[PDB]
Design a binder for this molecule. Structure first.
Ligand code: HEM
Ligand code: HEM
Ligand SMILES: Cc1cc(N)nc(CCc2cncc(CCc3cc(C)nc(N)c3)c2)c1
Ligand SMILES: Cc1cc(N)nc(CCc2cncc(CCc3cc(C)nc(N)c3)c2)c1
Ligand SMILES: C[C@H](O)[C@H](O)[C@H]1CNc2nc(N)[nH]c(=O)c2N1
Ligand SMILES: C[C@H](O)[C@H](O)[C@H]1CNc2nc(N)[nH]c(=O)c2N1
Ligand SMILES: [Zn+2]
Lengths: 404, 403
């Protein structure tokens, strides 16, 4: 009947219809001819319509839709655009947009927490040194000695004919990856390029597998400046296994704070090129992807050898067994150290609760199935059996190309 | 126009040009992706699908634009112009069947696509005859545990009349008996088909692993019930390589995965009954069939036997039991000398298939959500591989349940 996508859960037999997708003003990469769902990378008039839409979202969310203050704010926005080509958000408009951008993020499984975000307003920042102060404050607040708190710091928006604020690092905490004489990599192969950029800009590098990178921070029309994070600020967790005693001997570790720093936060047509945001980890991020991806730390074989598994044949499931233990090491070590973490079962249960909340509140929830389903034990989690509709809503976080 | 397709593990890139051959729209639009949805929500027409297919066939035998190609195009035209339909030659049917498998985006086993035994059952005129054909197929495919891909093709759909149909979703399925207490003994996925069998006269067993009888339907007739001779249905008792108590769970599975409810479309003609079989990938049994909450749902039972801490999600007791259940499937099939493939071997060979199809055809339609296995996703190479999904013809299609 209903003229909207029907959405089914195949575990429970239950059906909903996504009406929220009607609100989408931006096209994805799919067409009736072909689905491109699995691809990782997909003027005054334009801005004004995006701005009007954002302001309407803001006044709806406070239930003052159509009211005098709403119409006056609309008028204020177009007058400002009419005379400068841009406009500026009020403090509470920014807080709302930031939460909404997180709420709208299709690839994030942690969205049950969306209303609980500390928005640090840093739109007064005017130097790379001050970005560093702001960032250090973010890290201290967010880390909270292991009791992690979601946060985002917002630096000044893109301006006509003026350079961007950029953090060059993809996260505020990353391990160095050192290209070796034998072609191999010591540390994190993901970070080879950023490591080499740091050295070029005068960083004296280490030679470990877990050297915390410095930050490369760029203020408008300036070369980026290098800043070392004081080690007492970067909380890390040494990895041990609850029953396999040798696991600690591997000297594996990971940091507490997952903090994305290279994404663009778009709100009502305004673009915040530097707006680092953080939460807490889902255990599979560390245990499965970071430690077991072949193009990352690639430790599966080492761990299976320690576990004395038959690594010569696929059908011993040595890969699956070792990956489980590594993931269990991640959970146990964070729990022991009292650093917030969530396992993939609890995270996905909570995402299902979030889907239900959003069905009631907005009549849908944009979600990217391939990213929501965890990289181990997929169908053991409830999200695997849940159909999802993926579409772009604004405010949004958006990928941006590296500035170098 | 042509999408770039990247492997994120290796950094390699291709471009899919094959997708331009799609003539059938899927469920997505620029406004929203519906790629995760399980189901989709005239003379000149048939003639053009028929032409294109015949063109595909003569192309495949490198006789494109020859005399035989010309005269065959004319036969099809002449037949459609007079009767509103036409008929395939056996070799064309064989080609079209292999192509529908090749073109199937949810299938991880497509490296095998050229190795398919095709039984022509288009001279079938009764449920009885359907049954004999089905028994031949099973015996052939099973081959004492050395499984061989096969398909049997029953008579095409005709505008005048009802369809030949196999009511069962697979040739071999375990019954699900709805109990007094609303629980299900056996397989919850097969409650409805079990009740239909009983209603049409089947005396039911009471076990967890009772092989269902077949309900076969010839055009515009009530379906008929046929019991498969137990000697034809190969089964594998499940035991564990080290965990001695597992064998006592009394668990088992059938050797032969044989889809019997899909429609095969070739050159515009529709084959409403066309059962096909290969061999299992171990996650289908070990993860989905035994571990789904709405299936046999044995996870907790296994975890408790393993004496795991089931009180909390963070002990990863589900992940651990799931791995052992999969191991037990692999080991038991190996022990019983019945063909099986694990999810690492299958996805590695699927990657090879992708490369083969890239050179052969300029692409390969693939549904990522179905190609990536249900456990240990990112541990297989397919996780890190971008995929383009689209509908090519010949094709297997979903069709409504006949009741
Ligand atoms: C509160 C705890 C959180 C958890 C457990 C969580 C979980 C996750 C996970 C597992 C992913 C996929 C990441 C990957 O596989 O690389 C993700 C993606 C994402 N999340 Fe969260 N998240 C949390 C908080 C946040 C916050 C605070 C924000 C921003 C305000 C956010 C926004 C995003 C965005 C934009 C993506 C997509 C990133 C990309 O495409 O690179 N999440 N989340
Ligand atoms: C040779 C061994 C084969 C293996 C290991 C294999 C593997 C698989 C797997 C794991 C699936 C997904 C099943 C699920 O999750 O329900 C699948 C789907 C499928 N396969 Fe295969 N396959 C094989 C042979 C075949 C053959 C012989 C055909 C037809 C001639 C075929 C056509 C299909 C089709 C049409 C689907 C999608 C069915 C649906 O949407 O329900 N495959 N395959
Ligand atoms: C706030 C937050 C919390 C959390 N638990 N995880 C994250 C994920 C961070 C993360 C880690 N590794 C990789 C990525 C993906 C980076 C990335 C790369 C490309 C090519 N396209 C994208 N859209 C995104 C993101 C963020
Ligand atoms: C030939 C073959 C070989 C193999 N190894 N596995 C299979 C899996 C068959 C199979 C088993 N259970 C369930 C399904 C899916 C059934 C199915 C159900 C619905 C609602 N829509 C669809 N498109 C498909 C398929 C087939
Ligand atoms: C090719 C595929 O789109 C890609 O590997 C995706 C799949 N799903 C993912 N899901 C999450 N959460 N994170 C990822 O990096 C990926 N990678
Ligand atoms: C909703 C979701 O698309 C659905 O659960 C799919 C996911 N991937 C799958 N993949 C395979 N191979 N088989 C399946 O049944 C499913 N189920
Ligand atoms: Zn799509």
């Amino acid at each position: 009947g209903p003229k909207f996508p029907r959405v089914k859960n195949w575990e429970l037999g239950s059906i909903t219809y996504d009406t929220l997708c009607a609100q989408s003003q931006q096209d994805g990469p799919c067409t009736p001819r072909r689905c491109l769902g699995s691809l990782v990378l997909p003027p005054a008039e334009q801005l004004l319509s995006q701005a009007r839409d954002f302001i309407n979202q803001y006044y709806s969310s406070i239930k003052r839709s159509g009211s005098q203050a709403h119409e006056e704010r609309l008028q204020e926005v177009e007058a400002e655009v009419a005379s400068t080509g841009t406009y500026h958000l009020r403090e509470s408009e920014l807080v709302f947009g930031a939460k909404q951008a997180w709420r709208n993020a299709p690839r994030c499984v942690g969205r049950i927490q969306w209303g609980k975000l500390q928005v640090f307003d840093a739109r007064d920042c005017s130097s790379a040194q001050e970005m560093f102060t702001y960032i250090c404050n973010h890290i201290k607040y967010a880390t909270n000695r292991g009791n992690l708190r979601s946060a985002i710091t917002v630096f000044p928006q893109r301006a006509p004919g003026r350079g961007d604020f950029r953090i060059w690092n993809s996260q505020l905490v990353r391990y160095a990856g050192y290209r070796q004489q034998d072609g191999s990599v010591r540390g994190d192969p993901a970070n080879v390029e950023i490591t080499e950029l740091c050295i070029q800009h005068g960083w004296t590098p280490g030679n470990g597998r877990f050297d915390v990178l410095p930050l490369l921070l760029q203020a408008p029309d300036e070369a980026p400046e290098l800043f070392v994070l004081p080690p007492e600020l970067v909380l890390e967790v040494p990895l041990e296994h609850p029953t396999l005693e040798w696991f600690a001997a591997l000297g594996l570790r990971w940091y507490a704070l997952p903090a994305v720093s290279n994404m663009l936060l778009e709100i009502g047509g305004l673009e915040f090129s530097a707006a680092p945001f953080s939460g807490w980890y889902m255990s599979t991020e560390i245990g499965t992807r970071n430690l077991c991806d072949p193009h990352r730390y690639n430790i599966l074989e080492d761990v299976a050898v320690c576990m004395d598994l038959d690594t010569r044949t696929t059908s011993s499931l040595w890969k699956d067994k070792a990956a489980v233990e590594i993931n269990l090491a991640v959970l146990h070590s964070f729990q022991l150290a009292k650093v917030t973490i969530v396992d993939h079962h609890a995270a996905t249960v909570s995402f299902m609760k979030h889907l239900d909340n959003e069905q009631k509140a907005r009549g849908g929830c944009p979600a990217d199935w391939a990213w929501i389903v965890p990289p181990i034990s997929g169908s053991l989690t409830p999200v695997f059996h849940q159909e999802m509709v993926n579409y772009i809503l604004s405010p949004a976080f958006r990928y941006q190309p590296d500035p170098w």
